[PDB]
Amino acid sequence: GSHMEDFVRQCFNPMIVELAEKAMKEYGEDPKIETNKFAATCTHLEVCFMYSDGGSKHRFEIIEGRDRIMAWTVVNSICNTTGVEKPKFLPDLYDYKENRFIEIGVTRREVHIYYLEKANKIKSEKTHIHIFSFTGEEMATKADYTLDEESRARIKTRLFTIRQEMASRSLWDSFRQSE
């Protein structure tokens, strides 16, 4: 019973919490011990959901928040339909408007450091990368931030609200020095 766990359950939406619990357990991990990663998984989930909520109704296909098999199954259907190459690592969304997959990232370092980390992991110059930070910064591939400034601003605001709430409970320091 950690403070972080009870904060995550109060700060985040119940479906998002349930989805982060499944996702960690599927990879042999307990939201009750690795609670800093519990909070991070919820954060990454919410950001992905607000992101798809930006733009038009049929614009995005949500890959994050499914189980491994069904997620991949949809990645196929997208590839064997649009001709886009099959990514080596599971992405977060697919853009039907731009015809490309999106890897969303949420970092407690510089967006510089962390995009470099992921851009080297995925290597493929097809999958679009978009980064958010808890300080309000953002960095996307080819400076193509995909969404409206207003939609990205809402995400940035929510990320800073989570930081303040974590800090007022003294959990922020441990959360930052954990990534």
Ligand SMILES: COc1cc(CCNC(=O)c2[nH]c(-c3ccccc3F)nc(=O)c2O)ccc1O
């Ligand atoms: C790292 O171990 C895990 C790995 C997986 C497989 C799929 N992974 C993602 O889809 C993912 N995961 C994270 C993330 C993970 C832990 C802590 C902070 C994070 F931001 N960021 C992303 O951008 C992202 O796209 C499922 C749960 C995990 O616990």
Ligand SMILES: [Mn+2]
């Ligand atoms: Mn993902």
Ligand SMILES: [Mn+2]
């Ligand atoms: Mn991601």
